């Protein structure tokens, strides 16, 4: 998703989900490719 | 008026995106590798470009 | 009017700062909890005595 070629359109957006698997998001919060990182209900760093 | 004893006026530069993680309790590439704020701060900031 | 009841679940999900404003309102409802329990009782004493 992050990746991916092609997004969709806020008219229909593209859910796609992800289970049984191992989420490691150290190189989506620490990456500097993202100009905003927001987490509301939670804290950044915790999702480790 | 008010007045207190000390104060520890800093001096540095950075981006101005970069201006938002300078506030107490913030989280990005300045505040957990550069320059970082206590949660209780207390003071005022200034900046011109 | 908490995200929840469990603090571990705020400690272990939120920041410091974020949690504060959490873990506020839990000690606030529960201290209500504690004084309408010993007030009550405070009563039910005085009927026994």
């Given at each position: 998703?992050?990746?991916?070629?092609?997004?969709?359109?806020?008219?229909?957006?593209?859910?796609?989900?992800?289970?049984?698997?191992?989420?490691?998001?150290?190189?989506?919060?620490?990456?500097?490719?993202?100009?905003?990182?927001?987490?509301?209900?939670?804290?950044?760093?915790?999702?480790? | 008026?008010?007045?207190?004893?000390?104060?520890?006026?800093?001096?540095?530069?950075?981006?101005?995106?970069?201006?938002?993680?300078?506030?107490?309790?913030?989280?990005?590439?300045?505040?957990?590798?550069?320059?970082?704020?206590?949660?209780?701060?207390?003071?005022?900031?200034?900046?011109?470009? | 009017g908490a995200?929840?009841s469990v603090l571990?679940?705020?400690?272990?999900?939120?920041?410091?700062?974020?949690?504060?404003?959490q873990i506020d309102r839990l000690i606030t409802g529960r201290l209500q909890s504690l004084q309408t329990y010993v007030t009550q009782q405070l009563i039910r004493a005085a009927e026994i005595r």
């Amino acid at each position: 998703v992050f990746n991916a070629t092609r997004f969709a359109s806020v008219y229909a957006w593209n859910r796609k989900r992800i289970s049984n698997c191992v989420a490691d998001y150290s190189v989506l919060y620490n990456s500097a490719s993202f100009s905003t990182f927001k987490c509301y209900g939670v804290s950044p760093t915790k999702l480790n | 008026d008010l007045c207190f004893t000390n104060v520890y006026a800093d001096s540095f530069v950075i981006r101005g995106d970069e201006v938002r993680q300078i506030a107490p309790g913030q989280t990005g590439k300045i505040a957990d590798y550069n320059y970082k704020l206590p949660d209780d701060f207390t003071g005022c900031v200034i900046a011109w470009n | 009017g908490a995200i929840s009841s469990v603090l571990n679940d705020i400690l272990s999900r939120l920041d410091p700062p974020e949690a504060e404003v959490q873990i506020d309102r839990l000690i606030t409802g529960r201290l209500q909890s504690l004084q309408t329990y010993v007030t009550q009782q405070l009563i039910r004493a005085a009927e026994i005595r």
